[PDB]
Amino acid sequence: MKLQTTIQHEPKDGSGFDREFFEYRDTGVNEATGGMFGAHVIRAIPEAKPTWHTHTVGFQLFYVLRGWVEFEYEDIGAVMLEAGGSAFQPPGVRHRELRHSDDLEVLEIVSPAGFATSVVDL
Amino acid sequence: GMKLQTTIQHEPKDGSGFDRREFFEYRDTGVNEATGGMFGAHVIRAIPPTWHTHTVGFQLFYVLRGWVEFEYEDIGAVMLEAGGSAFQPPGVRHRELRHSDDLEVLEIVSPAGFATSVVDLE
Amino acid sequence: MKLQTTIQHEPKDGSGFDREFFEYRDTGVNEATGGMFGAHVIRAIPEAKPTWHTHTVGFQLFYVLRGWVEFEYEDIGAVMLEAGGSAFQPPGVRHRELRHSDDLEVLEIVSPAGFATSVVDL
Amino acid sequence: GMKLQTTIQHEPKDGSGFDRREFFEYRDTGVNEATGGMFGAHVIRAIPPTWHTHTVGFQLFYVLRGWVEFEYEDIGAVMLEAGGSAFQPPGVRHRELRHSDDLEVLEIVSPAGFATSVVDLE
Ligand code: NI
Ligand code: NI
Ligand code: NI
Numbered sequence A, C: 001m002k003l004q005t006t007i008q009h010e011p012k013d014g015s016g017f018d019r020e021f022f023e024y025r026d027t028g029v030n031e032a033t034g035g036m037f038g039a040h041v042i043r044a045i046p047e048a049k050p051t052w053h054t055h056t057v058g059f060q061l062f063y064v065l066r067g068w069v070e071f072e073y074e075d076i077g078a079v080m081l082e083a084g085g086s087a088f089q090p091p092g093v094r095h096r097e098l099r100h101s102d103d104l105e106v107l108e109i110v111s112p113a114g115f116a117t118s119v120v121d122l
Numbered sequence B, D: 001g002m003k004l005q006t007t008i009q010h011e012p013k014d015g016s017g018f019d020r021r022e023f024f025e026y027r028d029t030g031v032n033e034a035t036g037g038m039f040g041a042h043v044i045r046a047i048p049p050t051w052h053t054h055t056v057g058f059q060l061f062y063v064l065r066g067w068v069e070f071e072y073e074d075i076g077a078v079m080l081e082a083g084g085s086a087f088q089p090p091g092v093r094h095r096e097l098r099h100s101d102d103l104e105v106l107e108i109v110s111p112a113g114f115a116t117s118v119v120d121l122e
């Protein structure tokens, strides 16, 4: 297989509509679902040091609320997300974070809540 | 049998809380096409109340702008502003009471192609 | 998109290893998960009448425990499953059941438990 | 916070109940490759006990042949025979105590690529 890393950006004109390092604010989804899912807002603590890794996740989505963050993926390469940007990360995709703004705030929705993380041995 | 509980969180103001259909339009994150319909995620914006259920496993709303008031069978009326989130258990009976003209809300749901049923009140 | 209907058959030689109409026996998964998932064994009540349809499901898998059943899918066509056979059905795939043995027993694992079913209007 | 409960069912004998790693080998249903790793499902057979957890959302076992005894932090030791099922909550602490030489069990799990951790007993 592999699902594809899938990125969307918010068009700046209002179009697109049809009819140690971080701290976390919990939505309560983990407790509500017994850890089947988690959802939390991640904020940067106000560069440093990109590391290829993977997560033992089924579902994983990020939506940028404030600031900017640059990710890199084994399939699609480097992508810069600003507020309104979203990144769907396939199960276990090899990726890294390249850099982020000091005001970054991003919502993460994941399954399971309690995923493991492994550094890619290159 | 047993049911999960509708789970609401609000963003403190403050900045604490961190631990170290036809009247709407939709912007797709691409998660439906990325996952073959297992999941969907989209931003919903208002364009300037009927009890119902959805055939969903997972369903979460995160308010990006404005405000929206929902009502739930289990927990009653809930007013959400930016930063507020509502986890809606599978098939929970609920309705939307009112919203702001500037409402923007992210919805994450499994599956993408859920059905909606009006609740038989009688 | 679309994920692909995925069938496996149990090799008859022990290989493959590496190192109204129906009644239902519940595993308890629906109650345990608040309807996020369901799992139950379906048995035939001891022909009749194939109807193209879809289900509002994320995940859906069948594993045949006894007897045989012939399904048909919009993507892969007709497939006959015997004991040990499995069918992964993509979210909302158009399919039908063509015929089954009178002793059919099949395990279904689904998300959500409470999916809707729609007849395909042809 | 809150946790789902390990949920066991047994097949009545009778026929009622219907309502109208290195010591094992594995046969893949194809669900991992079909779903890009969101889910996996495989049949496990014995080849003729350490507390641990898995980083899984969904996890279900259905015994096809033989018997297997598990032990759970929440509900204790459980003996399963053919037709028995065990739903294992996300990350539940558990272990396998013993099994029959002819054990065959279907496992359905999300994600396919979960990690396993030995429980720190001290
Ligand atoms: Ni990561
Ligand atoms: Ni609704
Ligand atoms: Ni069907």
Ligand code: NI
Residues within 6 Å of the ligand: D052, D053, D054, D094, D095
């Ligand atoms: Ni285990």
